[PDB]
Design a protein around this ligand. Structure first.
Ligand SMILES: Nc1ncnc2c1ncn2[C@@H]1O[C@H](COP(=O)(O)OP(=O)(O)OP(=O)(O)O)[C@@H](O)[C@H]1O
Ligand SMILES: Nc1ncnc2c1ncn2[C@@H]1O[C@H](COP(=O)(O)OP(=O)(O)OP(=O)(O)O)[C@@H](O)[C@H]1O
Ligand SMILES: Nc1ncnc2c1ncn2[C@@H]1O[C@H](COP(=O)(O)OP(=O)(O)OP(=O)(O)O)[C@@H](O)[C@H]1O
Ligand SMILES: Nc1ncnc2c1ncn2[C@@H]1O[C@H](COP(=O)(O)OP(=O)(O)OP(=O)(O)O)[C@@H](O)[C@H]1O
Ligand SMILES: Nc1ncnc2c1ncn2[C@@H]1O[C@H](COP(=O)(O)OP(=O)(O)OP(=O)(O)O)[C@@H](O)[C@H]1O
Ligand SMILES: Nc1ncnc2c1ncn2[C@@H]1O[C@H](COP(=O)(O)OP(=O)(O)OP(=O)(O)O)[C@@H](O)[C@H]1O
Ligand SMILES: [Mg+2]
Ligand SMILES: [Mg+2]
Ligand SMILES: [Mg+2]
Ligand SMILES: [Mg+2]
Ligand SMILES: [Mg+2]
Ligand SMILES: [Mg+2]
Lengths: 457, 459, 459
């Protein structure tokens, strides 16, 4: 069974090649799941890259409205109709004959129906099947790949409205929009692909100006973090394609280290992106300048780009897209996320694990040095790193620990781990000043320093 | 697809402009969600904003009832027949023709229908409803008059509409909620879809007030303000920042309310207005305890500089509380506010709903350049461990941790500036005492180990 | 009641022989569970195994579609009319008579029907269906030809069939599932009942591949194999065992992957094949870090001795992963395998489903006489406490615990052979260092107490 490419970023790999040629694919889902978008995008990309005639059947939707709604993604379906490339047929063997006629009037390749469920109001489960079955057979006879749109009531219930459509259609795709904690998450899944292989389970996708966005080397080159001693602690600075992690309690120096790392990019005429999620530009600019860093300058040189946003505003799959797009445009040398902990609150651990995998996978695929920070939810930072499942994904771990010494709340920097590279295994004390960090010596005559409450030995 | 600004505080940002032009927007929700209110507001804010002739189609309720109902928001029916700005049509093609007639009659551009699900009593089938509902929107689309369609739902997280077909016929779907969690109703609005345009997905907390619907979707000065204490001001490196959020965490009876008192006192002392949002004790008690420390809060209220807003945290919703703060701040326009306490507002509340609150209050306090001192009673003896397990301690710019320290078989207390964003601060846990004139911050414990625990040992 | 071997890897053990002779077996499941595949396989493995004339009755799909569909498993339709081994009948007594006719026509013994629930569209009542369904099985029983009946279900844990009556009419009931848990589908097969015979109750994880359905239901040599390290080999008492499972637990960045590297290196060093199943880092990174320790994994791959299979643990199901290992081991046929790591495969997975995995991998590794070194990042600083809270540390024959030890305000690490089944081993927690040539296992900490905690104290 040959597969037809849809040029939909993600789907091509999730369906292992694309949609089965000659056969009809069902794309069911609730309202606003992107059933119509997918159907158009299948046709559009079809004759916008392969020039293979395709006709779109429409029921409770004026062709103008479709072409108008499609203009939201900068598409000219009217220009495609002004060259006889696409054909919108306004809307039961009558349609079957008309559809077969149109198809042959162009010499078909792809067809889209939106929606068949709407053209079954009058018709009763068994009646829908008998008519749906007959349709499904009258397409395979012509040998045209058709995407069939179907309506759903529940997100985790019947596949179709009458629960007899999935058993007729050869290929079943389910578009979802699950609401968890007042946050909407779009997930696409291929339930079955008769006579072929595909990826099982749902995959986080987002709808943008590009349309559907489904999301399914190792050089010894070293880059500076912005601290001479920190580079000496890491054994000649970080790697130019690795993922660093600054874990620690609130007000330790995670944002300070991010700044010094983002600065060191613009210091070497290298572009960097800072994704803020905790503070705003306003505070970031002041705090930065207080440490002797001119962020405003770095932005004036077109080397730094600050992108602050509320973590609880957009969804995790949306946050990633924003990064990708922001990285695709600016093309930064190194990026920083301040912080991951801000994007994990009010989210599932499974949905968050996939996020860090995506950002890490895309940061390393483009050879971009990433410095992600994370606020530990325990005083013993050593124990917080173990509970973190993202700490095994990262290549370097820079843990900042509070240490109570002589009734003073001092701090300590330590390179926890450094993959395929030597690092200093000493918990060096450090202080913050108007210039930045001052990594001094490591506590020698002190035991149980990992607790954050040591004892003189 | 052009957007029609509804002028509904919040919706204009969540809709990325507003409602699509010449498209049929559906608004489903359970009984008392605030559909009609939204529907009226849409027309109301249309007429008295961009001189737009709006036509309200009634069904269940009469024009008089609607006119009288909207009188709780101070909206007159002088735009009705007195001006010809509105057109309340008391109540399938028979009605559609009337809407098409009244349209060009007043040049009507904005249209509201309530309710469209009440005109499907003569039927019982979804197929019969779909066909008749599809015919309506289609007819309105030809007129090119972007209208609002009201529908009713049984469940809050069930089908979009009563017949589960009205959402797929319409282009724009807005779902108003009133979800009951722990005997507390939370009004949340969501835009499900917007055919041919973009919007914000997921639900957004809103409230109904005398203003109607209230949807809730580079300064950073180095200027320093006093905290009310001198040692504390020195501990932070010349007092707190102006547009900064301070947090005083500690065990119950450490001195969170004491610090809040001095912070509010210091405002009125500099002839600056302050607002104290009490949630634990009542004005009566607060007035007494304040004076015991040598502070006349009654005097400060007599100068129209300090305003105390006491209320039970287990009565109104977090969204209701936020609106109260906003309104109380918009009225009085203080220099600095104080919340006593966040912990009291977090009792029997979803951690999601709490974060959204604090973000909103922090966001509005920093936007209006207001110094906020929020308190939070720690749920452990080790205050440091409480700070770590908090999704707010990262949001606050300054953290003032008050810790109990058992020394020489005595219940002594210690204060320390945990953190101070973009500022030097004393990194020492110095013991403090409370007297009849406020706090006396003494010296830190040089010869003591494991003070964070609260049960230290002499070195 | 005699059993008909279906030759379906796993089913033959779960069915205690196979399907009952001259009895009507029902196979219900949701859409895409793999009913037709099972139905074809039943006939396919019947013809090309014990020369059995099988008749496939179609209903919804045509013979051409089915023939073309089964071409993804490399099965030709040369057994159809080209030989007369099969009999695809395109589509109540009218059909039954045809089945009874075609039966003796080809001497048909095996029969498959798909789907029997599609021929109940003309009806809507269960009583009408039951009567017509009962008549079918009864008629087939008289012929004495044991057939497979396909049915469709709406829910995964709801009624057995669409009309909830087909299970009680049939004698044998098999339920295929595709349960979605955490955006991950798990294919599980169960035999509900087997009237007049015994079987295995509860669901069993299976997978669909190019081989079709893959259901997953006294040696013990004293021979010793090297671990790649000399001190470690001495610590275990002359290296690890051959058909033994080793486990390296510890905190992130202790040296689990380092040990895995030496274990795999030592294989290829003795001209032995090894497979490294990476799940954390990618070949790119692994290749670099390996060389930094003085190991050329590229060289080992150039000798066709080492094979690296990197893949994301949060993409495929545990059953999908097991099949991959099995296939990759069946192809390459290594001396020793390595999993880096089990912890990475246990992320967002049911503890039940994980145990079944490890049992399966451990079981297959010990059965094929393959030395396995599985790693597992501990979720606590105290490694000993992690070992205890593990349903796998008891399954492993050897445990190699790597522990972080803060000594003289330095992050030093310690290694110790936690346990070694039927073998003496060094019972000392000796400190080790990592350099550009692998690990340097030094001496244990004689003058240190509470080392298990990770924060010891000088004695
Ligand atoms: N430019 C855009 N950027 C981002 N999102 C957009 C944009 N344009 C549309 N969308 C979103 O994409 C969704 C896809 O709309 P579409 O018509 O494909 O939905 P549908 O599933 O077919 O709905 P229905 O079945 O109710 O007709 C819209 O509802 C809207 O939320
Ligand atoms: N100008 C300064 N001079 C001295 N110390 C400073 C100065 N600015 C900041 N600090 C110190 O360094 C800290 C900086 O905190 P930073 O934001 O870098 O860390 P963080 O852990 O990421 O913070 P958060 O968790 O609150 O986001 C302050 O809390 C303070 O202790
Ligand atoms: N002035 C006001 N102050 C506070 N709350 C108010 C005020 N006016 C109305 N409300 C609240 O908002 C609601 C408005 O009811 P509205 O008619 O808008 O709801 P609806 O969803 O249209 O109801 P129905 O299902 O009957 O059509 C009131 O029931 C009340 O709970
Ligand atoms: N007049 C006083 N003289 C001495 N100590 C006093 C006086 N008034 C209060 N205190 C001390 O301060 C404590 C109360 O301080 P405050 O009310 O600010 O604490 P809090 O942490 O906000 O308390 P709660 O958790 O109950 O709201 C008393 O328990 C006592 O230890
Ligand atoms: N070669 C292959 N490799 C991997 N997966 C495959 C392969 N062939 C089939 N599959 C998977 O197994 C399924 C087989 O579908 P099958 O027709 O056996 O299911 P069914 O339960 O009979 O469906 P229906 O409800 O339509 O009758 C495919 O949909 C696909 O998910
Ligand atoms: N070339 C090297 N020189 C010195 N030490 C090194 C070198 N390469 C690695 N290390 C040390 O070994 C650690 C990595 O070892 P390894 O990757 O085997 O550990 P792991 O426990 O499997 O890590 P993870 O949990 O991240 O998968 C580094 O953090 C460092 O301490
Ligand atoms: Mg649509
Ligand atoms: Mg920060
Ligand atoms: Mg009303
Ligand atoms: Mg108090
Ligand atoms: Mg099938
Ligand atoms: Mg590793």
């Amino acid at each position: 069974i040959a597969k037809m490419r849809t040029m939909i970023e993600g789907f091509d790999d999730i369906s292992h090649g694309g949609l089965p040629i000659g056969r009809s694919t069902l794309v069911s889902g609730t309202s606003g799941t992107g059933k119509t978008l997918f159907s158009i995008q299948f046709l559009y990309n079809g004759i916008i890259e392969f020039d293979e005639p395709g006709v779109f059947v429409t029921f409770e939707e004026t062709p103008q409205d479709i072409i108008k709604n499609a203009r939201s993604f900068g598409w000219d379906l009217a220009k495609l109709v002004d060259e006889g490339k696409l054909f919108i047929l306004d809307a039961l063997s009558a349609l079957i004959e008309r559809i077969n006629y149109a198809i042959q009037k162009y010499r078909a390749r792809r067809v889209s129906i939106d929606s068949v469920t709407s053209v079954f109001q009058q018709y009763a489960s068994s009646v829908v099947r008998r008519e749906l079955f007959r349709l499904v057979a009258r397409l395979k006879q012509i040998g045209a790949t058709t995407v069939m749109t179907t309506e759903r009531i529940e997100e985790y219930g019947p596949i179709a409205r009458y629960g007899v459509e999935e058993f007729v259609s050869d290929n079943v795709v389910i578009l979802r929009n699950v609401l968890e904690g007042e946050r909407r998450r779009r997930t696409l899944e291929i339930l079955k692909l008769r006579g072929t292989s595909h990826m099982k389970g749902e995959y986080p996708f987002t709808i943008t100006d590009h349309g559907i966005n489904i999301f399914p080397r190792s050089s010894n080159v070293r880059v500076s973090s912005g601290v001479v001693r920190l580079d000496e602690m890491c054994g000649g600075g970080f790697f130019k394609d690795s993922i660093i992690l600054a874990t620690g309690a609130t007000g330790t120096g995670k944002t300070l280290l991010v700044s010094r790392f983002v600065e060191n990019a613009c210091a070497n005429k290298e572009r960097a992106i800072l994704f803020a999620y905790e503070e705003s530009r306003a505070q970031l600019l002041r705090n930065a300048y207080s440490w002797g860093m001119d962020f405003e300058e770095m932005e004036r040189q077109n080397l730094l780009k600050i992108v602050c946003a509320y973590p609880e505003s957009a969804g995790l799959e949306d946050h990633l897209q924003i990064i990708k797009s922001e990285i695709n445009d600016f093309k930064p040398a190194r990026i920083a996320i301040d912080s991951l902990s801000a994007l994990a609150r009010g989210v599932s651990n499974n949905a968050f694990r996939q996020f860090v995998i995506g950002v890490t996978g895309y940061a390393k695929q483009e050879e971009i040095t990433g410095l992600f920070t994370n606020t530990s939810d325990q005083f013993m930072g050593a124990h917080s790193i173990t509970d973190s499942h993202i700490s095994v994904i990262t290549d370097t771990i820079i843990l900042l620990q509070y240490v109570e010494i002589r009734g003073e709340m001092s701090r300590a920097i330590n390179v926890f781990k450094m993959r395929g590279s030597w690092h200093d295994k000493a918990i060096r004390e450090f202080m913050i000043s108007d210039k930045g960090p001052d990594i001094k010596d490591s506590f020698r005559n002190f035991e149980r320093i990992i607790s954050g409450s040591p004892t003189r030995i």
